[PDB]
Every structure is written in C-alpha cells, then in structure tokens.
Ligand binder design. Structure first.
Ligand SMILES: C[C@@H]1O[C@@H](O[C@@H]2[C@H](O)[C@@H](O)[C@@H](O[C@@H]3[C@H](O)[C@@H](O)[C@H](C)O[C@H]3O)O[C@@H]2C(=O)O)[C@H](O)[C@H](O)[C@H]1O
Ligand SMILES: [Ca+2]
Ligand SMILES: [Ca+2]
Length: 425
C-alpha cells in the first residue's frame, strides 16, 4: 500500500491520495512491512496537547512519534516526502512543551525503516537542570534503518542521537541552528548535530555495529557538530562537513564545546572509572571537512585507543587536529597522553586564524602519521585553495539530497601537485 498524509488531511480519512491522513500517529496505526507513506510537503504543526506515543526512562521522556513497527529485509516501511510534489514536509515541534519531560521527536525502536526528505524544527527544552531533547533517538534493537536527506534545525534539540542499534545509515542529513537556550543558563553544552553513543546494553555484532554518518552537514550546533563519546562499538563519519559549531546560531557568541568531530572518549572523571567496552573501538572520520568550529577540528577526545583520521581537511578550526588520548588501562587520577594507535593519514590543514594550530598531542611512535600537509616542507596558504567562501558550505543540497558542489577547501591544480593525495576533496 501507498498511504498519504497532508497538513490539511484528516485522521478520519482512509489515507489515499484524494483523502490523506493528517498525522504520523495515524500512519503508525496502519502501516505494515512493505508499505510506503508519501508525506505531502508543507508545515505540520504538532499540537501542544497531542499525547505522546510513548515515554521512556521512567517517564522522563515524552516521545512524539514512536517508530515502533518494523519492515522486513527487502520490505522496509518507508516514510518519504511525496516525490510527486515540490517542496519539503516540515514538522514544527515548537508547541510541544510537556512539563518536566525531555522530548524525543522520533523515538526509533523498529527495524527495516526508511525515512527521507523532511525537516524537524522547533523542538523544545523546558527542563532547567542537566537535560537534552532529540529530534531522532535510536536505541538497542533498531537495526537496518536508513535516514536520508532529513534536516533537524532551528530548535533546541540534538539532531540525531544513537544509544544503540546496528546498521543505521544516516545519509545526506543536515543538523543546524540547534541551541538549548533554556537549561543551565543557556550554555548549550549538550546540543550536538550528530551523536554516536552506542551504550553498554547494545554491544555486539549486529547489535551495535555498522552505524555510519555519511554526507551529513552540522553547523551552528551549540556544542559539537559530531560527537562519538561513550560509544561502545565503532562508528564512522564519512564525507561530512562540520563548521561553526560551539557558537550561538548565526553569531560568534560563545556557547558549548565547539568541536567539529569529537571522535571518541569515555570521559575524564576524577571520582570514578567510566564503563567501557571490552575492545576499544576504532572510530573513523574520513573524507570530511572542519571549518571554524569554535575550539577544535578533528579531536580524539581522550580516547582509550586508536581512531582513524584519513583524508580530511581542516580550515581555521582552532586545534585543527588534536589526538589526545586518556592513558590506558583506566586509572585515577585520569591522565592525558599523546595519542596512540591512531592512523592519521592524508590530511590537510590551513591556519590563518589567530590561535589556531595544525596538530597537537600525537605520539608518532605509536600512531601512524603519514602524508599530512602539516609535516611537509611548505606551509599551506589560502590561495592554495580555489575558494574559502563560507557561504558555499551552506548551499542547498542537490535535488537528490547530495551535498552541493563547492570549491571551498578544494586545492587548485598547482597546489594539488605540492600536496598530493591530501585532503577530503
Ligand atoms: C537518561 C540518562 O542516561 C544516562 O546519562 C546519559 C549519558 O550516559 C551520560 O554520559 C550523560 O551524557 C552527557 C550528555 O547528556 C550527552 O548528551 C553527551 C553525549 O554526553 C555527556 O555530556 O548524561 C546522559 C543523559 O541522558 O543525561 C544515565 O544512565 C543517566 O543516569 C540517565 O538519567
Ligand atoms: Ca558538551
Ligand atoms: Ca557534545
């Protein structure tokens, strides 16, 4: 079956093209494996009083849409912007403010799902202590899903937040202009674009493995663009752009941590040891771009082992590459050391911003550090690039959702010969 929804539809309708549904709550009542839902473009304001589809964590979370049904292998359930209509569906969550609860807009427990082509805006935070909300929260048991050309923006919530699940592909998604102005004095320190945090409950082959962020952009998230702390299976970030994170949206006002790619770690607590996986995962950041994050570009974040940083480009992102690891095995007090077991290869780094640096805190005897611009005999300069115009990075995606063509961060023909094989382009 192909069902339809529309902002001016009705949940008393049958869900046909002529008589569409109004909400995903009704969609969820009827769909089965192999069904397709075409979501007509327009603005869907979620009513303030719409009851949550579920709650989690002893009532802490109000979950707007519970993506609880599953497809089968070869027969997904697909929730797609209607490809026969121009424009995008935009779910506006600005009225949803349940007292004393965190918000999850799409709480994903099902498997074999395909979600494409729509936006989630205005997601709220009302709690004033330590808190967060998420546009997408994916957990243990949610396997073999695809999230494509989705945009989580102009709200107070983390865009994508993985606590578990396997083979979740987050492809060509944007998370931008996300800032929690409400909690903890409006620091914004828990709002990332994309978070990979496969927890202890979700470990194992086919249980927490295989999740990938690909082709995604994160900008003006108040904390980090991408963050893989406390992530018990390897997560990969491939062909992603992370820029202008750590600032309040549209400004250079200081907010949170400002990392482009925070690519590991299990914390640096002084009081107690963190839980850790049995095998420290080798997360990866490859063919990616960091530009003008407030503090750091590509960061090992006190990892307890090796990360792969391959074929990336950093421009004016503070510490463009920082390989700091925590000393292993775990001990107290916690100790930072030069990064060990990393692969740092074929990277490019430009510095013309005051206080920015190429690479810090790498152990070259324990990490493979090869063919990076910062270890060559010539400095990388601005005119080695075709363009460094920031606006290019915010250009509209192509109609199919692919990243826009840009010259930003692309070496000229002449420079490419002097920095051969280096950088994300
Ligand atoms: C619902 C809570 O879940 C757990 O706490 C998580 C997380 O395990 C903690 O490490 C910590 O994480 C913070 C941020 O909240 C998180 O977004 C970021 C990626 O890492 C740390 O900065 O708090 C989390 C949280 O959700 O509050 C624990 O099981 C808590 O007891 C539980 O309330
Ligand atoms: Ca933070
Ligand atoms: Ca973060």
């Amino acid at each position: 079956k192909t069902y339809y929804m529309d902002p001016e539809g009705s949940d008393s309708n049958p869900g046909t093209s002529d008589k569409p549904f109004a909400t995903l709550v009704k969609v969820q009542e009827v769909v089965v494996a192999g069904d397709v839902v075409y979501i007509n473009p327009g603005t869907y304001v979620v009513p303030a009083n719409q009851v949550p589809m579920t709650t989690t964590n002893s009532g802490l979370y109000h979950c707007v849409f519970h993506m609880n049904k599953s497809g089968e292998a070869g027969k997904p359930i697909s929730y797609l912007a209607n490809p026969n209509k121009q424009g995008r569906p935009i779910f506006d969550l600005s009225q949803v403010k349940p007292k004393d609860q965190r918000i999850t807009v799409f709480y994903v427990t099902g498997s074999n799902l395909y979600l494409k082509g729509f936006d989630v805006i205005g997601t709220q935070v009302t709690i004033t202590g330590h808190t967060q909300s998420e546009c997408f929260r994916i957990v243990k048991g949610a396997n073999n899903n695809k999230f494509e050309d989705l945009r989580t923006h102009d709200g107070m919530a983390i865009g994508f937040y993985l606590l578990g699940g396997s083979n979740n592909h987050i492809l060509n998604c944007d998370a931008y202009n996300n800032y929690d102005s409400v909690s903890e004095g409006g620091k914004g320190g828990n709002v990332d674009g994309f978070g990979g945090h496969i927890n202890s409950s979700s470990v194992g082959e086919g249980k927490g493995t295989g999740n990938v962020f690909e082709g995604c952009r994160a900008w003006y998230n108040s904390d980090d663009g991408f963050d893989l702390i406390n992530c018990f299976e390897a997560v990969k970030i491939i062909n992603c752009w992370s820029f202008l994170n750590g600032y309040k949206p549209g400004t250079k006002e200081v907010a949170g941590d400002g990392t482009g790619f925070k690519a590991g770690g299990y914390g640096m607590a002084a009081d107690k040891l963190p839980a850790i996986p049995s095998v420290i995962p080798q997360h990866e950041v490859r063919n990616s771009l960091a530009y003008y994050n407030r503090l750091r570009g590509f960061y090992a974040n006190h990892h307890l082992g090796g990360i792969i940083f391959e074929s990336n480009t950093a421009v004016n992102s503070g510490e463009n590459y920082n390989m700091t690891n925590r000393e292993s095995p775990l001990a107290l007090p916690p100790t930072d050391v030069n990064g060990y077991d990393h692969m740092v290869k074929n990277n490019l780094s430009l510095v013309t911003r005051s206080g920015s640096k190429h690479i810090v805190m790498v152990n070259r005897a324990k990490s493979e550090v090869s063919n990076n611009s910062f270890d060559g005999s010539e400095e990388v300069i601005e005119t080695d690039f075709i363009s460094l115009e920031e606006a290019e990075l915010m250009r509209d995606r192509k109609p199919n959702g692919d990243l826009p063509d840009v010259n930003f961060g692309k070496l000229t023909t002449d420079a490419e010969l002097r920095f051969w094989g280096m950088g994300c382009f």
